[PDB]
């Protein structure tokens, strides 16, 4: 029913979004979700810039043209000790997503995100969860593909 969107701080405009605490985003839902954050799927160059200033996660997610995981420090539980903006080869499942926002500043922006700003009307309880754990709840919808809403 409800949808929790757990987000990171933005690094050079790039951020991670995880839905409902598990890998649950398709490519079409990823595009809709970035759009609802006034954002786009990142390019590889945008990911590399974010990586260069400290962005890493232990999660795979969509970008433009790939599914990736950004890694600075090797960890056996996060792409088997690989580093870089690491590209997933077998990439047909559901993941998290990354998003790029053009308005964000060049370094790290942790300003609280207090709604999903480019959603539309709907009946879903949507909660933004910031990196600091603070939760902000609204009603709306952001998905435009029937196959995502009604599998």
């Amino acid at each position: 029913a409800q949808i929790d969107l757990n987000i990171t701080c933005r690094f050079a405009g790039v951020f991670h979004v995880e839905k409902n605490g598990r890998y649950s985003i398709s490519r079409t839902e990823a595009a809709d979700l970035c759009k609802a954050f006034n954002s786009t799927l990142p390019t590889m160059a945008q990911m590399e810039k974010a990586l260069s200033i400290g962005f890493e996660t232990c999660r795979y997610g969509f970008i433009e043209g790939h599914v990736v995981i950004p890694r600075i420090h090797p960890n056996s539980i996060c792409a088997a000790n690989n580093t870089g903006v690491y590209i997933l080869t077998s990439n047909t499942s559901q993941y998290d997503t990354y998003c790029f926002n053009a308005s964000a500043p060049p370094e790290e922006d942790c300003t609280s995100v207090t709604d999903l700003p480019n959603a539309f009307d709907g009946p879903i309880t949507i909660t933004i969860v910031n990196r600091d754990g603070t939760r902000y709840v609204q009603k709306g919808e952001y998905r435009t593909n029937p196959e995502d809403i009604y599998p």
């Binding site: 933005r10 006034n38 954002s39 998003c99 926002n101 308005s103 964000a104 700003p117």
Partner: peptide, 4 residues
């Protein structure tokens, strides 16, 4: 207007 166009922020996260």
């Amino acid at each position: 207007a166009a922020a996260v």
